[PDB]
Symmetry: C3
Subunit: 306 residues, 3 copies
């Protein structure tokens, strides 16, 4: 019957396509973005204090940056023939010392030598002090702090539009003692690591003890057709590895690096750091709509079809 | 009236959809890209000369790489109880020295000690020589130079297509003394930093003195349906942070890193570098069109609807 | 004739749009991904042995990481006035020594001095031992090994869906001696570098001797409408620079970095490493489909038009 058809013709276009879907909908997916991240704060580890240039492994301050929370340090690693402390590689003869396994110290030379007094392991060639990743080192519990400053600037090239999250209404006096809280200061770009993990929804102790990646997505669903001040950034913080993390193997994200030094000598040595950190990832996504000319007649024709 | 309808039926399809819009329009957004960037040149700073392995902080040579233009260097930073040179933290008693503020040197121990002769500041624990970011250090004015070599290779998997910006027509003799200028050599992949900032549209002195990110987009709007040599890369250089830069706080992009050394001793020390640089970002985007079979009948049906 | 039209109405919708194209097709392009890469293995170079913290230049273990295969090492590089070993810069007088060329050692001072006994080259200012990139250093032929562990976790936010490539069915005992082979273990996330280059389709010797980038794409074409275990990752390994590589200039991807040390002195020195490596790139792409409500009536209307 055409009686219901007459109503349903406008119940879908005007109700949803026009008023809700913004029937014009001139989009621009290609948004060019720039993110600058700066970590600030001071932490205590073992018996010393470290700053931004210490727990932040990548100094670029790009959208990807690791905040180290747990360290395993091995100092004065010189090269030579050395045994290992891995109890999973017990040998009593050289026969079970040839190349058939996956050593963690170095290439086996087919020699089972004593380690300290009675522990016999295959002799390896490489850095002598083998790292011990079976000791629960104290976590940098001061890592609820160290604020993060995120400067984001985006451009829509087709619309020529340009906007940054550092609006002129914010001064240095405000930024001196500014936090992030999306009920009273949605706009302040000074995040807190503890606040970030709280918004993610996990306790900070476990994440700092095991490591992970927390993605901070800045969505810009703007309304350029309306006033330009209505395009408001939206911050969403979500764990990324935690989906595949649960309780299976590889219970976190950890990496290994080293610092290389040299005596007044002909030989070098490195200090090895195995770091469990919280690698922050910054992602920028969004779109803008404009009234334009072309989609109006297209939508009119589409309504004519109905 | 059908008289105007007959004309308007083909005025929109043949005029725009067919001839201009390439009605077939078989697209492939998923283009796999590889960018290799190599900076070359030698610069003078203070009283010494540095090369590519010095001002280019990330040695990967990926699409993201910082060209350092200004340095603030603090040498022989040993750990201990030290004061700070920040005049914004004046104290006359220990009462205003407990933890309630945002120190830039280290964790305050609640002790206000003299700095040099009469300047009293809260005693901090950490690296002793505090950095001074209030001195206008000379800018590396030689940074108009240091050419950049960009090797870009892309593949369209659905179309199997493959192309790189290093065409076989270019030899080493040409690349020896080749610049970039999109009127006589659009194709030479040897950019100049001064040329890049000039095409961006800002004076190099201000950018090198404050820092920023300059995105270089390589657009490949190819015409695979036609001859394969007509797919020509287009280079567009645009500032990214400059949108949110203007004259507000945080007037540039700067980072901090350090180099760690160790004496014939039991103690370590680091040299801290606060760098204001021009971080070049390389982005690859584009699409390809093919005649194919499917869209032809779809467009024919769409024309039949009109 | 309507006789063939009646058949062709359903020959295109039911045959292709409905059964094959999954007419509902509720997509989600915005998939949030996290990739953690860990290289393991030990290699022999010159007369020493190196581990993960040595040939893997970026210790972040992100989607982009270089596996160094060939090194050119210059040790004890101190600053001063030094000549160069580049035979392409022969001079017999100071007149052809002013600034008009592209030096590889440093800024020319307009002085042509002897190099060793009879070779005269322009005197440069900078690091004294100039690197020699014209000697075929032995390739790390042990680079067929050093397995790679890739942990990938993805989330579809609109569908709330969440999945990682480290499924609970895999334990540590399996991962201890697990390889990657897409006929018997498609699911094991332990790739082999030799296996990766074999699947790419090039001999490993040439790639390790010249360098390149090998992209590993993990496609997730899931069927969330069906059981969630049917969404199976697909690994595709493809060379990226090899398209623009062929036999033209710049026959590979190489970079330069250095390690900085300091004596018990007032001067510093660096050891320079020119590295030809295989930079692995990890890309994540995919989409998911859901039955939903909206597209059903849209497809019904589209069929009504026919
Ligand atoms: N390339 C690889 N080849 C084989 N096993 C690997 C590889 N990378 C990681 N693994 C294994 O994955 C598991 C997770 O290790 P993870 O990276 O979380 O750190 P870990 O348990 O401290 O071990 P590791 O000492 O091996 O670094 C371990 O059982 C480890 O042996
Ligand atoms: N994590 C942070 N917490 C608080 N304030 C911050 C943070 N990061 C940056 N700021 C502030 O942002 C402003 C811009 O500083 P910027 O990074 O441009 O370098 P700067 O002015 O030399 O300062 P700084 O010595 O703090 O590095 C400063 O007022 C600084 O205090
Ligand atoms: N910024 C640049 N300006 C000029 N020529 C460059 C630049 N970058 C690379 N080239 C040239 O590109 C070619 C490829 O060099 P490539 O990077 O593959 O290493 P190479 O041949 O060992 O040379 P190099 O000693 O210059 O690093 C060389 O002829 C080199 O001179
Ligand atoms: C991290 O910073 C917070 C504040 O930003 C510290 O927490 C406060 O410390 C003061 C110290 O006197 C207490 O009075 C407050 O009750 C604490 N909580 C709050 C909400 O203010 C905290 O000590 C810092 N360090 C760590 C490890 O959390
Ligand atoms: C400067 O302008 C900005 C943008 O409007 C203000 O920031 C937000 O403004 C909205 C107004 O719709 C308020 O609801 C928010 O509470 C504001 N957030 C923050 C963090 O301020 C900002 O308040 C303005 N500054 C002023 C008025 O001093
Ligand atoms: C950067 O390189 C340019 C050339 O590539 C140098 O500029 C020229 O220097 C010569 C020196 O005799 C002058 O004769 C020219 O007039 C200069 N300009 C041009 C356009 O050739 C420049 O000196 C280098 N350094 C800096 C800091 O710009
Ligand atoms: C090698 O072929 C390339 C691709 O055509 C040439 O590069 C451009 O060719 C177009 C022809 O349409 C010219 O208009 C441009 O001026 C060329 N640019 C450059 C930088 O050369 C290139 O010229 C060819 N090399 C030759 C003929 O020696
Ligand atoms: C890389 O590892 C492979 C095995 O993963 C080594 O190849 C085997 O070495 C044993 C040594 O006794 C031989 O018996 C086998 O025939 C070799 N091949 C295979 C397929 O097992 C190889 O030696 C290692 N190193 C290099 C440089 O390839
Ligand atoms: C655990 O479940 C996974 C997911 O099904 C199994 O992995 C694959 O399962 C498919 C079943 O369709 C097999 O065809 C593949 O051969 C399996 N691949 C691998 C590497 O195992 C896995 O087998 C299961 N583990 C068990 C049953 O122990
Ligand atoms: C380094 O110094 C030690 C003594 O501290 C010495 O035994 C060793 O031989 C030196 N290394 C080299 C390469 O000479
Ligand atoms: C480092 O050397 C200095 C003397 O130059 C000495 O005072 C200091 O105690 C040494 N550090 C350690 C940890 O022994
Ligand atoms: C470094 O030590 C050498 C001797 O090994 C000396 O000639 C030189 O002057 C020292 N450098 C400085 C800056 O004193
Ligand atoms: Mg382990
Ligand atoms: Mg400051
Ligand atoms: Mg060369």
């Amino acid at each position: 019957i055409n009686r219901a058809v007459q109503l349903l013709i406008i119940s879908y276009f005007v109700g949803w396509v026009f008023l809700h879907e913004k029937a014009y909908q001139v989009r621009d997916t290609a948004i060019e973005s720039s993110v600058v991240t700066k970590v600030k704060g001071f932490g205590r580890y073992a018996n010393r204090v470290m700053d931004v240039s210490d727990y932040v492994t990548p100094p670029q301050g790009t959208s990807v940056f690791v905040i180290i929370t747990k360290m395993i340090v091995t100092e004065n690693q010189m090269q030579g023939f050395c045994p290992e402390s891995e109890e999973k590689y017990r040998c009593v003869s050289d026969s079970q010392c040839g190349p058939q396994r996956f050593p963690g110290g170095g290439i086996l030379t087919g020699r089972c030598v004593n380690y300290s007094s009675t522990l016999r392991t295959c002799e390896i060639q490489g850095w002598c002090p083998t790292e011990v990743d079976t000791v629960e080192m104290p976590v940098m519990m001061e890592a609820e702090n160290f604020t993060i400053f995120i400067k984001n600037s985006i451009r829509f090239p087709l619309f020529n539009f340009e906007k940054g999250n550092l609006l002129p209404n914010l001064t240095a006096a405000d930024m001196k003692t500014c936090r992030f809280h999306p009920d009273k200061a949605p706009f302040c770009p000074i995040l807190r690591v503890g606040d970030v993990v709280k918004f993610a929804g996990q306790d900070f102790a476990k994440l700092a003890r095991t490591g992970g990646v927390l993605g901070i997505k800045i969505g810009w669903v703007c309304d350029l057709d309306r006033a330009w001040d209505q395009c408001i950034p939206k911050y969403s913080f979500t764990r990324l590895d935690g989906v595949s993390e649960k309780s299976s193997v590889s219970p976190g994200y950890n990496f290994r690096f080293a610092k290389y030094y040299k005596m007044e000598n002909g030989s070098e040595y490195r200090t090895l750091l195995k770091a469990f950190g919280i690698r922050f990832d910054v992602l920028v996504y969004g779109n803008a709509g404009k009234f334009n000319i072309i989609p109006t007649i297209i939508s009119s024709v589409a309504a004519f079809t109905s």
